[PDB]
Design an enzyme around this catalytic site. Sequence first.
Site, mmCIF file in Angstrom:
data_model
loop_
_atom_site.group_PDB
_atom_site.id
_atom_site.type_symbol
_atom_site.label_atom_id
_atom_site.label_comp_id
_atom_site.label_asym_id
_atom_site.label_seq_id
_atom_site.Cartn_x
_atom_site.Cartn_y
_atom_site.Cartn_z
ATOM 1 N N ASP A 7 2.463 -7.111 12.202
ATOM 2 C CA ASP A 7 3.176 -7.904 13.155
ATOM 3 C C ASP A 7 2.592 -9.236 12.483
ATOM 4 O O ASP A 7 1.570 -9.797 12.420
ATOM 5 C CB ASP A 7 2.241 -7.615 14.011
ATOM 6 C CG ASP A 7 2.869 -8.940 15.436
ATOM 7 O OD1 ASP A 7 3.888 -9.614 15.102
ATOM 8 O OD2 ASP A 7 2.396 -8.901 16.569
ATOM 9 N N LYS A 68 5.622 -18.802 9.260
ATOM 10 C CA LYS A 68 6.783 -18.403 9.913
ATOM 11 C C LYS A 68 7.987 -18.970 10.510
ATOM 12 O O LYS A 68 9.140 -18.767 9.908
ATOM 13 C CB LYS A 68 6.046 -17.283 10.692
ATOM 14 C CG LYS A 68 7.604 -16.922 11.837
ATOM 15 C CD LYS A 68 6.804 -15.695 12.596
ATOM 16 C CE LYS A 68 7.480 -14.824 13.585
ATOM 17 N NZ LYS A 68 7.020 -13.592 13.855
ATOM 18 N N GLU A 172 10.969 -7.386 15.750
ATOM 19 C CA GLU A 172 9.371 -7.011 16.867
ATOM 20 C C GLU A 172 10.059 -6.576 18.192
ATOM 21 O O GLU A 172 9.124 -5.486 18.960
ATOM 22 C CB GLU A 172 9.368 -8.752 17.276
ATOM 23 C CG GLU A 172 8.681 -9.183 15.776
ATOM 24 C CD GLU A 172 8.376 -10.488 15.599
ATOM 25 O OE1 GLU A 172 8.427 -11.654 16.984
ATOM 26 O OE2 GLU A 172 7.993 -10.976 14.888
ATOM 27 N N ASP A 196 7.972 -11.654 25.304
ATOM 28 C CA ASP A 196 6.910 -12.053 24.910
ATOM 29 C C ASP A 196 6.905 -13.446 24.746
ATOM 30 O O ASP A 196 7.716 -14.212 23.840
ATOM 31 C CB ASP A 196 8.298 -11.322 22.904
ATOM 32 C CG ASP A 196 7.331 -11.482 21.873
ATOM 33 O OD1 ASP A 196 5.733 -12.237 21.780
ATOM 34 O OD2 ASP A 196 7.143 -10.425 20.707
HETATM 35 N N1 LIG Z 1 -6.627 -12.770 27.433
HETATM 36 C C1 LIG Z 1 -5.530 -13.387 27.616
HETATM 37 N N2 LIG Z 1 -5.668 -14.705 28.283
HETATM 38 C C2 LIG Z 1 -4.623 -15.422 27.755
HETATM 39 N N3 LIG Z 1 -3.979 -15.979 26.953
HETATM 40 C C3 LIG Z 1 -4.107 -15.061 25.707
HETATM 41 C C4 LIG Z 1 -5.834 -13.678 25.717
HETATM 42 N N4 LIG Z 1 -5.157 -12.928 24.263
HETATM 43 C C5 LIG Z 1 -4.992 -14.309 24.048
HETATM 44 N N5 LIG Z 1 -3.841 -15.195 24.690
HETATM 45 C C6 LIG Z 1 -3.328 -16.339 24.260
HETATM 46 O O1 LIG Z 1 -2.608 -16.071 23.245
HETATM 47 C C7 LIG Z 1 -2.056 -16.888 22.652
HETATM 48 C C8 LIG Z 1 -1.585 -15.823 20.602
HETATM 49 O O2 LIG Z 1 -1.278 -14.171 21.101
HETATM 50 P P1 LIG Z 1 -0.240 -13.087 19.834
HETATM 51 O O3 LIG Z 1 0.824 -12.190 20.981
HETATM 52 O O4 LIG Z 1 -1.688 -12.813 18.949
HETATM 53 O O5 LIG Z 1 0.332 -14.499 18.764
HETATM 54 P P2 LIG Z 1 1.379 -14.254 17.612
HETATM 55 O O6 LIG Z 1 1.587 -13.199 17.692
HETATM 56 O O7 LIG Z 1 1.322 -15.534 16.717
HETATM 57 N N6 LIG Z 1 3.002 -15.385 18.955
HETATM 58 P P3 LIG Z 1 3.606 -16.368 18.434
HETATM 59 O O8 LIG Z 1 2.623 -17.485 17.824
HETATM 60 O O9 LIG Z 1 4.678 -17.010 19.102
HETATM 61 O O10 LIG Z 1 4.531 -16.071 16.701
HETATM 62 C C9 LIG Z 1 -3.211 -16.963 22.174
HETATM 63 O O11 LIG Z 1 -2.351 -18.938 22.255
HETATM 64 C C10 LIG Z 1 -3.751 -16.909 22.562
HETATM 65 O O12 LIG Z 1 -4.903 -17.792 23.446
HETATM 66 MG MG LIG Z 2 3.416 -11.028 17.450
#
Ligand SMILES: Nc1ncnc2c1ncn2[C@@H]1O[C@H](COP(=O)(O)OP(=O)(O)NP(=O)(O)O)[C@@H](O)[C@H]1O
Ligand SMILES: [Mg+2]
Length: 378
Positions: A7, A68, A172, A196
């Site tokens: 991912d 991205k 996704e 998401d």
């Molecule tokens: N337990 C939690 N509570 C709240 N926020 C969280 C928690 N764990 C992670 N996050 C937040 O989740 C975000 C990252 O989500 P994640 O799905 O891992 O990123 P991603 O896959 O790169 N999605 P995107 O940036 O939209 O392409 C960050 O802003 C973190 O601070």
């Molecule tokens: Mg993701």
Amino acid sequence: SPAVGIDLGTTYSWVGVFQHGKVEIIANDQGNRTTPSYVAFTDTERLIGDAAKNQVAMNPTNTVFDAKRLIGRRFDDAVVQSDMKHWPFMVVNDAGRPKVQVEYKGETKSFYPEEVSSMVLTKMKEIAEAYLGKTVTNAVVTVPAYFNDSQRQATKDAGTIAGLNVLRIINEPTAAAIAYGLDKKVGAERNVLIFDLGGGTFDVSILTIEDGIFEVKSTAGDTHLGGEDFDNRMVNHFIAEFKRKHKKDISENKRAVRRLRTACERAKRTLSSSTQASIEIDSLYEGIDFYTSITRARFEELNADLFRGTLDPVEKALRDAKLDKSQIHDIVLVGGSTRIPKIQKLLQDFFNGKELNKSINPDEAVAYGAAVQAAILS
Ligand SMILES: Nc1ncnc2c1ncn2[C@@H]1O[C@H](COP(=O)(O)OP(=O)(O)NP(=O)(O)O)[C@@H](O)[C@H]1O
Ligand SMILES: [Mg+2]
């Protein structure tokens, strides 16, 4: 033949493997299951992930992120021209294609977006090989359902540059549904809504699964709404607090703000499981320590409008799919921000109390489904 599911997120990247009937989301050598989508260039080395993110305040024009948002796009694309205004690194035009320009080992170098992402993919490959003790070549890599062919091909090319054999590029939200086995529920057609909310983006997708075949009915959301906006609200909150207590504005000290932001992101995560969280920063500004706290209620109040607004793309997705909310069979939480209790409560209330699929760590659900798919195809 061990294949991994990857991912590649806007802010963080995850890699999993399905082995002996279980999906392992693979941690790196420091025990961290996530790799920031960051690449940095210095006088002497190329940094990837947390190593790159940790020095961004000191080396801002050579630390690259958000690739991205550029991948598969052309330079004159209005998306690219708008996003360039918010990045501290240079984006240049090479024959119609955007390239990031940086200084690296004393020389000017430029990279296509799929080259930057391939560096993140190279680290993911090493992480999986560190865990498996074997060479890893085959991979399923996921992309948002709205990505067009150019963005899909460039994401695949990023895998190919990293030495990966990309078995398939899949959406996704489809990976998320596969993680929950929703295609294996033998019965009538199933309407699935994927909610998401990540670090930088908010994606709502409605899929229909008939006879085990996935079809995207609609997509909605906000490409510039995510956990980072909630961090921003916390940072502004504590900047105002520090000024109120010490009559000093830390805004123009990039290192101070970055250290406050890191504390705020960590506090936010803690507020998903606790009703309060501590902020502890030694010598934040001009020798002054910053030790304070924040409740879950205050964090919710600072973000109340952003939280409530996530429901408008849900309504729009349902409108486009021509479905009433009651016709949704499964709701799937994806993305790290959906661990926020207020977001879960808002969405479950929106669906009249219907239980949400959330037993798979939402920020791991896409990589989980990608890993299952990679095993099916290898
Ligand atoms: N337990 C939690 N509570 C709240 N926020 C969280 C928690 N764990 C992670 N996050 C937040 O989740 C975000 C990252 O989500 P994640 O799905 O891992 O990123 P991603 O896959 O790169 N999605 P995107 O940036 O939209 O392409 C960050 O802003 C973190 O601070
Ligand atoms: Mg993701």
